[PDB]
């Protein structure tokens, strides 16, 4: 049994997404090591369109192995500002590198339209709290 990687520098949701603050107004989002391992080899990733306004907790996609499908949720409100085009051809990046090249999308927040990031991040789990949720 491998112990799943949970980078200390990320935030998480209980539903096994990670959130990296990539800029003042941007988070990058993927699924955790635990999630990718549980799902199985990702054969498909449905991500939302760049520009899509998302609200926290909203289903905006799905990640799919041959055995399993899992909804992807917006961990924060904002707008999808990037999606990882690599996953079209190489979806198993999610499995091989869940926190790196396997990232799914970015959500950009404007303070104006949605919660400032500082605040948005307060709904999210830290690495330790995420680990705490896991039955691994």
CATH number, residue 108: 2.40.50.100
How many domains does the chain divide into? Answer: 1
Structure token digits, residue 86:
């690599």
Range of the domain at 12: 1-136
* CA–CA distance, 132 with 42 (Å, rounded to integer): 25
Residue 112: DSSP 8-state: T
Q: How was this structure determined?
A: X-ray
The radius of gyration computed from the CA coordinates of the chain, to the nearest angstrom, equals: 14
Tokens 């799902």 label which residue? 39
Query: Phi and psi for 112 in degrees, rounded to 5?
Result: -50, -60
* CA–CA distance, 83 with 105 (Å, rounded to integer): 4
* CA–CA distance, 131 with 91 (Å, rounded to integer): 25
Single out the residue of 135, 84, 129, 103 nearest to residue 29, CA to CA.
103
Please, which residues bridge with residue 12 across strands?
18, 125
Structure token digits, residue 22:
């990539």
Tokens 């707008």 label which residue? 79
């Amino acid at each position: 049994h491998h112990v799943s990687d949970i980078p200390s520098d990320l935030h998480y949701t209980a539903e096994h997404e990670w959130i990296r603050r990539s800029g003042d107004d941007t988070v990058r989002v993927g699924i955790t090591d635990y999630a990718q391992s549980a799902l199985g080899d990702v054969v498909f990733v449905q991500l939302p369109v760049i520009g899509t306004a998302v609200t926290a907790g909203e289903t905006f996609g799905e990640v799919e192995s041959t055995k399993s499908v899992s909804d992807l949720y917006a961990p924060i409100s904002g707008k999808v500002s990037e999606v990882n085009s690599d996953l079209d051809g190489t979806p198993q990046l999610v499995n091989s590198d869940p926190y790196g090249a396997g990232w799914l999308l970015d959500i950009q927040v404007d303070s104006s339209d949605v919660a400032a990031l500082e605040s948005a991040l307060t709904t999210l789990l830290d690495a330790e709290a995420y680990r705490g949720t896991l039955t691994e």
